[PDB]
Design a protein around this ligand. Structure first.
Ligand SMILES: *[C@@H]1O[C@H](CO[C@@H]2O[C@@H](C)[C@@H](O)[C@@H](O)[C@@H]2O)[C@@H](O[C@@H]2O[C@H](CO)[C@@H](O[C@@H]3O[C@H](CO)[C@@H](O)[C@H](O)[C@@H]3O)[C@H](O)[C@H]2NC(C)=O)[C@H](O)[C@H]1NC(C)=O
Lengths: 311, 98, 97, 55, 48, 52, 52
C-alpha cells in the first residue's frame, strides 16, 4: 500500500462564513466544489484530510485537521455536509468528499473537533442537478427506464487526476512571542521559527531554540513558524514563498468520473380517446413530465410543454 | 467544462513583485499593491503598506472532459443501409445489406 | 464567453486549448489572501441546460436518431429501387403449375 | 527506462539513490528531489519509490 | 379513470363496487420481486 | 388482551433507494403510505414492528 | 413560514412550541444572495448586538 498522505499536511484557510455570519480561518474550508456528475453527486475539496490519522495510517473512521501548528484527530462520524438539508456522504478520502445533496443555494461542511468544538464553513453554491431523461423526479423508482449518466466513482485509485502541492508559507503566530522586561522571548516549541523586529540585528531566520531579543518590545517584532517537512495543497487561499515555481509536487486524486447508468421513472399511461383527426389525452403526472409531439411529414411542427398536473 | 487554475498567490513583503507572460490558453497576471493579509495567527508579514500580491490564473480543460464533452462535427454524405424482409417462395428471409 | 465553444480543443487528448472566458483578476479583500476573479461561466454548462430538443424529437419524416455511430433511421422519405436476380431453376413452367 | 535527476546525477526513476524509506530518513531532501522531477514522465514512478515504506 | 366516480358503490357499507382505474400490470425489473403497474390516480383525490 | 404479533415476524424487502443512490434489501421498507386524513397526518406501513 | 423553539427537559422530555411566522429577510443591496461572499462590497445593515 502507498501512503502519499504521509508527506501532505492539513491546513487552515479563510472561510467567508463560519456559521455565525462572520468570516474566520477554519480547519475546514471549501477549496472547490465539483459537480460534473450528471447524477447530481458532488465532489467537494476541503482543507481536512479524511481517513488519515495524525499518525500516518489509513483509519477510515478518523479525520485529521489543523489545530494551530499541529494536526489533530477527530471522528469521521461527526463529519457532515449540508445544503438546504443534510447530505448523504457516499465516500471520503484525503481532501475529497463525495456527497448526494438536496437542492439548495448554499453548501456547508463541518465537523466536531477533538475538544467537542463545532467547526463549519459555508460557501454560496447553486445546486440544481440536471434532468436525466424527460421527467423531473425526486427519487429513484423501483420500476423504470435506464439512461446513461456520469457519476463519481468510489475507487480510491486515480486516473490522471492530480493536484499540485508545494512547500507551505511561514505561519505567523503572535502567541509565539512575548515581552520579558523589554526583551522579547521567542518560544520555539520544537518548530523552527523565523522572526524579525524594528530593533537592530533582529533578523533571526534560524531559531531552533527559545531565544530572547534584548532591548526590544513585542510590538516591534514579528515571528512565524517555518515548516519545510511536508507538502500542502496549492490552494488559492494560501500564499507561496517564491516569486515563481516554489515547487510542484503532484498528488493523485481519488474518485474519478465514470460512465454509469441511471434509473428513471416512466410516466403513467395516458387515458386516450379519439375524435376526427384528433387524439385526446388525459395525463396523470406524479412529477413534472415533458410532453412533446411532431408531425411525421415534411414539416414536423415540433411542440413541447412541461406538464405539472392533470391535463 | 473548463477549470480555472489559480496557483497559490505570491505575497512579496517589503517589496514589489512582477509577473511574466505565459502561453497558457487564457492567462492573466496582476500585481496588487498595498496588501496587508492576515493569517490565523496574525498578520502575514512585517511591513504594513509596503507589500505586493501577485495573482495569476489560467484556463484549462477539466478532468471531466474525458467523459463529459460535446463533439462538433462536419457532416457530409451518408452511407445507406437497410434490413429487408423478403417472402420468397413461401419462406421468410431477412437480409442485412447496404 | 458564456456560449458554446468558449473552450475548444481539436481532440479529447490534445493539450492545445483555445479559450475565451474573459477571466479578469480582481483585488483581494483587505486582510485576506484569496484571489477573486470575474469569469464567464462555462458555456458548456449553460448549453446543457439550454440544449432544447434533440433531432431525435424534432427531425422531419419521423426520423429516429442514434449515436455511436451517428445514425438517422427509418426516415419516410422518397423511395428505394430494388433489383432482383432470380435463377431459372426457381421458375416453374405453366404446364407444371 | 525513464531517468530522474537528483544532484547533477541521474538514475532510473523507479530506482533512487535513496530507497530505504527515503522520506522518513530525509524528508526535506526527498521532497526536493521529487519537485525537480515534476516534468518527468517517470515522476509518479519516483513518487512511488520515495514515499513507499515497509518497516 | 382519473375522474370523479372512477370507483363507485351504492352505500358506504356496500360490498358492490365498480371500478375503472386502468390497472395495467407491468413487467418487474430484473432481479426483483416487486409488482409494477400503471393505474390512474384516484379521481376522488383529484376532485378534492 | 393478547399479542397478535407473537405469531407475526418482521421481514426484509426490496427498497429502490437506501440513501446511497442505489437499491438494496432493507429491514425497513415502505409498503404503503396512507394520506386519507385531511389534517395531513400520514400512516406509513413498514416492514418493521414497533413496540414489539 | 413557521418558528419553533424547544429544549430537552431534565427528565429527557422534549418540549417545543410552534408559532406561525413569515420569515423572509429583506434584500440588502441589489442582489439576492443566500450567503455572504468571499469578495464583495459592504453596505449599511442593522443587527442585534450580542451585548447584554
Ligand atoms: C412471414 O413474416 C410475416 C411477418 O412477421 C415477421 O416474422 C415473424 C416470424 C415475426 O418475427 C414477426 O415479428 C415478423 O414481423 C408473417 O406475418 C405475421 O404473422 C404473425 C403470426 O405468426 C401475425 O401475428 C398475429 O396477429 C394477430 C392479429 O393481431 C394476432 O391475433 C395473433 O395472436 C398474432 O399476433 C402478424 O400480424 C403477421 N403480420 C403480417 C404483416 O401479416 C408471415 O406469416 C410469415 N410467413 C411465414 C411463412 O413465416
Amino acid at each position: 500500500n502507498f501512503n502519499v498522505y504521509k508527506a501532505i499536511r492539513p491546513y487552515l484557510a479563510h472561510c467567508p462564513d463560519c456559521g455565525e455570519g462572520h468570516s474566520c480561518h477554519s480547519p475546514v474550508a471549501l477549496e472547490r466544489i465539483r459537480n460534473e456528475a450528471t447524477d447530481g453527486t458532488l465532489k467537494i475539496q476541503v482543507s481536512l484530510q479524511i481517513g488519515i490519522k495524525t499518525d500516518d495510517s489509513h483509519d477510515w473512521t478518523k479525520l485529521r485537521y489543523m489545530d494551530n501548528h499541529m494536526p489533530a484527530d477527530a471522528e469521521r462520524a461527526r463529519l457532515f455536509v449540508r445544503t438546504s438539508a443534510p447530505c448523504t456522504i457516499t465516500g471520503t478520502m484525503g481532501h475529497f468528499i463525495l456527497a448526494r445533496c438536496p437542492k439548495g443555494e448554499t453548501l456547508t461542511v463541518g465537523f466536531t473537533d477533538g475538544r467537542k468544538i463545532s467547526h463549519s464553513c459555508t460557501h454560496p453554491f447553486h445546486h440544481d442537478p440536471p434532468v436525466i431523461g424527460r421527467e423531473k423526479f425526486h427519487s429513484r423508482p423501483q420500476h423504470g427506464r435506464e439512461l446513461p449518466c456520469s457519476t463519481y466513482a468510489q475507487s480510491t485509485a486515480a486516473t490522471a487526476e492530480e493536484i499540485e502541492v508545494h512547500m507551505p508559507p511561514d505561519t505567523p503566530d503572535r502567541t509565539l512571542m512575548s515581552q520579558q522586561s523589554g526583551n522579547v522571548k521567542i518560544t520555539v516549541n520544537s518548530q523552527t521559527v523565523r522572526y524579525k523586529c524594528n530593533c537592530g540585528d533582529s533578523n533571526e531566520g534560524l531559531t531552533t531554540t527559545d531565544k530572547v531579543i534584548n532591548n526590544c518590545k513585542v510590538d516591534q517584532c514579528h515571528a512565524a513558524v517555518t515548516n519545510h517537512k511536508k507538502w500542502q495543497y496549492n490552494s488559492p487561499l494560501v500564499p507561496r514563498n517564491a516569486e515563481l515555481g516554489d515547487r510542484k509536487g503532484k498528488v493523485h486524486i481519488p474518485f474519478p468520473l465514470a460512465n454509469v447508468t441511471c434509473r428513471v421513472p416512466k410516466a403513467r399511461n395516458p387515458t386516450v380517446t379519439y375524435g376526427k383527426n384528433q387524439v385526446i389525452m388525459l395525463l396523470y403526472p406524479d412529477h413534472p413530465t415533458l410532453l412533446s409531439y411532431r408531425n411525421m411529414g415534411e414539416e414536423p411542427n415540433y411542440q413541447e410543454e412541461w406538464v405539472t398536473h392533470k391535463k | 467544462e473548463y477549470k480555472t487554475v489559480i496557483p497559490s498567490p505570491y505575497v512579496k513583503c517589503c517589496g514589489t513583485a512582477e509577473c511574466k507572460d505565459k502561453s497558457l490558453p487564457d492567462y492573466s497576471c496582476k500585481v496588487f499593491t498595498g496588501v496587508y493579509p492576515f493569517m490565523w495567527g496574525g498578520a502575514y508579514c512585517f511591513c504594513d503598506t509596503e507589500n505586493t500580491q501577485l495573482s495569476e490564473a489560467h484556463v484549462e480543460k477539466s478532468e471531466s472532459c474525458k467523459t463529459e464533452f460535446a463533439s462538433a462535427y462536419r457532416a457530409h454524405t451518408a452511407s445507406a443501409s437497410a434490413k429487408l424482409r423478403v417472402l420468397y417462395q413461401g419462406n421468410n428471409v431477412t437480409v442485412s445489406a447496404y | 464567453p458564456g456560449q458554446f465553444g468558449d473552450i475548444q480543443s481539436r481532440t479529447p487528448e490534445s493539450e492545445d486549448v483555445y479559450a475565451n472566458t474573459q477571466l479578469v483578476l480582481q483585488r483581494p479583500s483587505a486582510g485576506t489572501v484569496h484571489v477573486p476573479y470575474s469569469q464567464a461561466p462555462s458555456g458548456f454548462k449553460y448549453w446543457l441546460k439550454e440544449r432544447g430538443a434533440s433531432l431525435q424529437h424534432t427531425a422531419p419524416f419521423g426520423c429516429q436518431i442514434a449515436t455511436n455511430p451517428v445514425r438517422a433511421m427509418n426516415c419516410a422519405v422518397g423511395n428505394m429501387p430494388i433489383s432482383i436476380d432470380i435463377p431459372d431453376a426457381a421458375f416453374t413452367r405453366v404446364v407444371d403449375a | 527506462p525513464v531517468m530522474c535527476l537528483l544532484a547533477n546525477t541521474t538514475f532510473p526513476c523507479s530506482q533512487p539513490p535513496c530507497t530505504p524509506c527515503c522520506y522518513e530518513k530525509e524528508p526535506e531532501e526527498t521532497l526536493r528531489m521529487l519537485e525537480d522531477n515534476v516534468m518527468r514522465p517517470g515522476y509518479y514512478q519516483l513518487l512511488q519509490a520515495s514515499l513507499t515504506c515497509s518497516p
